[PDB]
Design a protein around this nucleic acid. Structure first.
Length: 190
RNA sequence: GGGUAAUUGGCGCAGUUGGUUAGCGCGCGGGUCUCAUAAUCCCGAGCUCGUGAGUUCGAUCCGCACAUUCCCCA
């Protein structure tokens, strides 16, 4: 088009998409600015966050911890480092990897408390795309967060390793293990 | 003495040349106190020698405690 928004002025958003159909439209990949810092008043309506650039969604959860509240610049720097690492291991575009990972996480079934359900009677139910993406993001970030506490290595390396593993679907990753646990326990209750 | 069967995690039982096994039981967690529920996790000369076999709780033999029946001229 007139301009391509090379993220961090390196990686583009052109030949990028999502395979899964359920959440294809709940993932914005084209309205990314050069820098994932938009003062957009997202979270104002009920479905407007479905248009937020996925990367900004990701960075907005890396500062979940109470100590690190209100720190977006460090988050953008971290994300850039992780993207270079992904490019160096894989050779491909990290955005593709990130979208594939967010798709490969996220439970497809969960247990709730329907009707009266006395005596821990929990039926099974399916899940909406929005919750799937939210949980995927939250799980990736929390998994990288848990690995780098009181450990030598930084947060960025743990982040990138988690992301690539999840894109691979390997059970070794934290998010995949959580998803499998939840899906199974819910199957028991179905 | 003669025959039959068994000794297994702290607790009784299924398991027999390729799982240390199944529950009960220990405590830490969740599930509107949170127990019936569900997750994870822990506990072993498998009575004892030889015995061949890739490999025995596991398959022969050696000895011992428990349980039923039966025999008896120092």
């Amino acid at each position: 088009m007139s301009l391509e928004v090379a993220l961090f002025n390196k990686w583009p958003l052109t030949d990028v998409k999502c395979q899964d159909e359920s959440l294809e439209a709940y993932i914005s990949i084209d309205n990314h600015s050069f820098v994932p810092h938009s003062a957009g008043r997202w979270s104002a309506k009920r479905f407007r966050k479905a248009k937020c650039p996925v990367v900004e969604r990701l960075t907005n959860s890396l500062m979940m911890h109470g100590r690190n509240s209100g720190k977006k610049l460090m988050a953008m720097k971290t994300v850039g480092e992780a993207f270079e690492l992904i490019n160096l291991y894989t050779g491909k575009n990290p955005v593709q990897v990130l979208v594939d990972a967010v798709a490969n996480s996220g439970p497809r079934e969960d247990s709730c408390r329907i009707g009266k359900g006395g005596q821990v009677r929990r039926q099974s139910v399916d899940v909406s795309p929005l919750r799937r993406v939210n949980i995927g993001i939250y799980n990736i970030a929390t998994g990288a967060r848990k690995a780098a506490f009181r450990k030598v290595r930084p947060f960025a390396e743990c982040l990138a390793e988690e992301i690539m593993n999840a894109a691979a679907g390997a059970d070794k990753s934290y998010a995949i293990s959580q998803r499998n646990s939840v899906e199974r326990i819910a199957v028991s209750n179905r």
